[model samples]
Each structure stands twice: as structure tokens, then as C-alpha cells.
Target: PLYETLNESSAVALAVKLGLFPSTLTCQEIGDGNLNYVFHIYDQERALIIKQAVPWPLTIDRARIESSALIRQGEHVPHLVPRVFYSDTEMAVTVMEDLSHLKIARKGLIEGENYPHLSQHIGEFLGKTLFYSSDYALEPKVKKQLVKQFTNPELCDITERLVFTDPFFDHDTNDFEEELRPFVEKLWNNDSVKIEAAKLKKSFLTSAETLIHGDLHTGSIFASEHETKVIDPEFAFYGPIGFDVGQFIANLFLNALSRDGADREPLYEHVNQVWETFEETFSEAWQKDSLDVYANIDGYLTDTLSHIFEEAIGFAGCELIRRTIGLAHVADLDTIVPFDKRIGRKRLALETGTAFIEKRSEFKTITDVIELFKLLVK
Candidate 1:
């Protein structure tokens, strides 16, 4: 309960208790996330970042529990993520190492920065985390227990409504540029789009495939040219594995579309590399861990990956559509700040997203996704 209402002075005082610095410390509130208050605490010798969950409609206490468990279990890479110094449930605060030097990937990409290691690192993270946390890795009993522990109904409900339901229907929460009105109307009136979207939504609601970084997007990641880190697993849950993979690639696609196709090749290339790496690494992990299983089936891993890939395409479409028409909009498009540029970019996003949803099964390879981006971009 300490520092429930933390500010510059109190944050410093709390850091002093943790022995991060001497009595002389400086603090700044620097979080830009939608769900929390983040503070940058520092002195000459050291600095740490503190994140206080902004009281969601449900208990985000699961984040601290799940994240700590993942780190301890090696499901999350230690150095890639911030070093957790301390955490408190009552106050809903987590103290971690400062990554101020690293930039938000979305912002960094928009500024034309290239991260050679980005795709490889994220691909491994996604593959390992998702594979190790699912039934394929854990015993049936253990996996079920974990599922019960991570039954995040409220947060998952938000995804169900915002990402799946709201965008397809007329909702007060949905908004878009004036130029997108026609496209939005078409989306609402299209029975085929609604039907496909409904199928994906049902899977999202019922499928408990693996433990996923439920809000895995560019904003949730921080990186530089050399180092990549995944932050904010507060929305972590047992859900469709493809949702995380899809949300991430969709954001990359959005970034490319928002910049009017500048630096497009590298962005799309990264998407390809990420999916390839994920497929390879996921297969390896499955083979290595499935050494001892109850029922053995032929070509199961291949079939599983293919299924995830299909779901990834569908979910990517969902993410793209939601960001354009749902309540929360990313800066990749909003930051354009010019109405004309913003409208054109968002329209492109809607068009690309709708195609992916309608044609979710038509594509088979990561190359197919890359080609789709090429064909859609002007």
C-alpha cells in the first residue's frame, strides 16, 4: 500500500527504500501505456522503472503472478525484459530496471530506425513462451491448473468486445475518419465479413491453446538497433496462440501502411523473418518437449503450425480492423497529424485488414502475407 499515489517526490522516496540510490533521487512519470502509470526513478548511480497498474475493471494482480512465474520458469528471457526488483499486489505496482535508452518499437520504426536483431529475438520469445506454456509442453494436469490460475475473464472480455465484436457492428465506441465512412458502412453491411469475423471471435472466446502475451503489439515492445525487450504482459492469459502473433504482425503492417509505404521492404521482410523463425522454433520446441507424450500422432506438429498460421492471418485482420475502427487507436496512424495523410493511411489499413479476414484461408505461407502487403500497398 505504500506510495499508492506516487509522484516525483514519493517515487524517489520509495526508491530510497529499495536502496536504488542515496537519499538524493529524482523521479519522473513517463508511462505512455493505456493501462498503467509508469515512473522513471533515478539518481547518479542507478535508475529503475516503476509501473503501477491503473486499476482495471478486473484484478491485474495476475500480471505480477504470471510474469514472475514465467521469469522464474525461464519462459521469459531475463535480459530481454526489465529486471524485476520488487512488486506489491495491494498497490498494484511493479518495480523494474529502467530501459529509457531503448525506444518504443512503433515510434522507432516510424522514425526510420532499423533493428536487425528485432525479428529474430521476438520470434524466439513468441515461440518459446507460447510453446512452453501450452499442453504440448506441460502435463495435462499442470496445464489445466495454469489455465485456471490465468482465467482472465474481464481482460479477455475487453478483447472479445473491442477486437472482435465492436468493429463489425455499429457501436458508439467505434470511430473513424470522415473519408472512411463509406468503407465502414460496407464493412457493417457485408454478411461474409461478419460471418468470418464471427468464426474468429468464437475461437478467441473458446480456444485455450497457450499462455500468450495477450496484448502483444509494437507499443508493448521496446527496442534499439541491437537490444529488444518485451514489456507489459499485464494482459497475459491462456488464449489462442495466434492472437499474439497476429496482433504483432498486424501492428507492423499498420506501421508500414501509415508511413505511406516508405521503408516498406524492411518492415514486410521483418514480418516474414518473424513468422519463419516462429515456425522453425516452435517446431523445434515441440519436438524437443514432446519426447514423452501420452498419444502420438503423425505430422501433428505440421498440422498444428498450419492451424496457428491460419488463425494468425484471421487475428491479424481482426487487430488491423480494431485499431482503425475500435476505441483505441495507435500513434502509427494517429501521429501522422495531417488529416489527409491519416485518412489515406487508415483506409489502406481497413482495406488490407478486410481482405485478410475474408481470405484467411487462401494464404498458406509467410510469403503469402508479404505478397499481400505488396499487392495492397500503393
Candidate 2:
């Protein structure tokens, strides 16, 4: 509610008052986002992060509600997320682990660096976390409790619906940054785009594949040379596996767009390699594990999921467009200025995202995947 320069001493006093922690060792602002204030804290050798949900959304242009339970709920699977230390219900604060070594995946990608093992780590996280938490691995009663824990209306209804409903439409609620108005207006009125959006919405509402990291963008990732850490699960909910994969892929395309003039042919090779790694690692993990928590794991279901993911690439493409050029703008595209050169930036992002979505079904190998990415920029 007020702007105060927060430090470790004040945070330590607050933690002590809650009687949840012996002390708070550190506090630092983590990032800038629409909802809450994220800060890192430490107690002795161990580290934690704190998320404070304020009533007003940070973005001066939009409105959003921050969910309190998402912090502890993410603790349900700490390896995939930051460990939750404590939460204060009255202040709506969530204290969790500080994933310090990781860097935003886009920061590296924007500089023309490729992440070789990111896909493998994410694949493992998705496969293992989903499998262990799903009904296939847990008892029905336990699974129900886990599902019930995610029943936060503030998180789901207010947040997730933005992408699925508002931005994908011709409605006035969807606002665009001035320069992007042309692209937004065109996409807003496209029938095929609407059809694609509707399909994504259906999947968003119905699928029960796993507890998906609902908004798994490149921004959600933190990485180093060896590991990747996923953060910001305020959008976490029960959804299809494809939602995670497609969102991750969409951000990859977004990264390429942001760095349009940067030599992307080699980057395409890296993207291909990442997907190949993703496929091999994920398929292996899926087969090796007995986590049969699929809502419909029948051959038909498996076949449909495969097809749906491919189709989702297109949907994810639209998602990238709407976010980049419409209501939400990412730094990936914003970093490249020279207004004349932005046409290339927008073109690269939109086309690359679109191609990934359109031809995902025909792509069986990593090379094909990489080549498809190249085709968009060409």
C-alpha cells in the first residue's frame, strides 16, 4: 500500500513476529511483474524468497489480484519451484527460497547465447512433478486434496482468464501499447485466430493432465550454464502437458524475434537441439515412470494429446503474438528499437511463432523443428 525501502532488519522483525522463522537473513527485490513483490531472504546457510501480494497490480495500465496460497502450494513440489519458508495470511506475504544462481533465460538468449540443457531440465521437471502429483501416482484422496489446494479463485479466475479470453478477442478490455495497435486489431478480427483461441480455451478449461505451471514463459525461467529454475507459479493450475510445452516454445520463438538481427540460423540449431533433448528426455521419463495420471491415457488419448500439442503450437503462436504486440509486451521485442527495424522484429516473432504452431504436426525430428524455425525468419 505504501512505497518503503524494505531491508533485511525490518523483514527479520516481521518474520520473528510471525514466530514462523528464527530470523530473516536477507531481502532484495527480485523482479518487476504485474501482481506481487518478490524478495529474497536467508536464514543462516539456508535461503528463502518472500512474495507480498498487494491489492493493486503493479502495472499502471492493468488490473490483477495476487493469490496468497500459490506460495505454499508451490512448496508441494520444491524441486520444480522455490522452497516455501512461511506465509503471513493478514499481510498476504509468502516467504520462500532464493534461487540465486539462475539468470533469466531470455537475458542469455538476447545476447546470442544458447541454453543446451534447458529443455532436458524442464522436461524432467514437468514429467516428474506431474507424474508424482497426479492421480496415477498418488491415492485418489490425496490427489483430491492437492487439487483442492489449487482452488484459489483469486489465482485462477482473475489471472488465467486474461490470456484465454480477453487478449484473444475484439473486446475493449484488451489494451495494446500504441505501436502494436495494427497487429492487435488485425489479430483481434481474424476468424481462424478466434477458432484457434477457442480451442486453446477449451483445453485450458478441461484438461487434467497434471498440475501445470500455467504461465511457463521464458520470463518464468532462471538458468545458468548447467541448470534452470522455474518461478512465478501464481498462474499454476491443473491443465494439459501441452500448455507447458507450447508456452515454453512460444517464448523461444519470442527470444528469436527480440534478437532479429542476431545470427539466428545457429540459434535455430540450438532451438532444435533443445527440442530434441526435450523429446528424448521427456519420452524417456514418461516411459520409465509409472505415473499414469493421464485423464485419458488410452491409446486414443495419447494419440489425441500428441496431435493436440502439435496443434497447440499454432495456438501458442497466437499467444506469443497477443502478448508481444497486444496487451502485454515482453522485453524480447522491446529491446530492438530503430522503429524501421521493428517491422523485422515483429515479423520475426509473429511468423516464427505462427510457423511453429502451424507445422508442429509434421515435425517428427529435431532437425525438422529447427528448420521450421529458420523458415519463419527467412
Please name the candidate that would achieve the greatest TM-score relative to the true structure. Answer: 1
lDDT of 2 by residue, 1-378 (tens): 533433556666666676656642656666476356666666664656666654523331111112332443354435556665665455666666677777788787777667777766676665555555555556767767767655445445543556666765666556545666676566666666567666766767776655666777778788877877777666666666667666776777677666644465544554555455555544554566544556435574457446645744755675676566555667777777787567666755655554554455776655666666666566
lDDT of 1 by residue, 118-173 (tens): 88888888888888888888887998998887777777788989999998999988
Q: What is the lDDT of residue 74 in candidate 1?
A: 48
Report the C-alpha displacement of residue 307, candidate 2, in angstroms: 3.8
Q: Which runs of model 1 end up more than 4 angstroms from their true locations? A: 1-3, 19-23, 33-35, 56-74, 291-298
Clash pairs detected, candidate 1: none
Model 2 misplacement above 4 A = 1-8, 16-31, 42-47, 56-80, 88-90, 158-161, 173-186, 260-262, 265-270, 291-305, 354-369
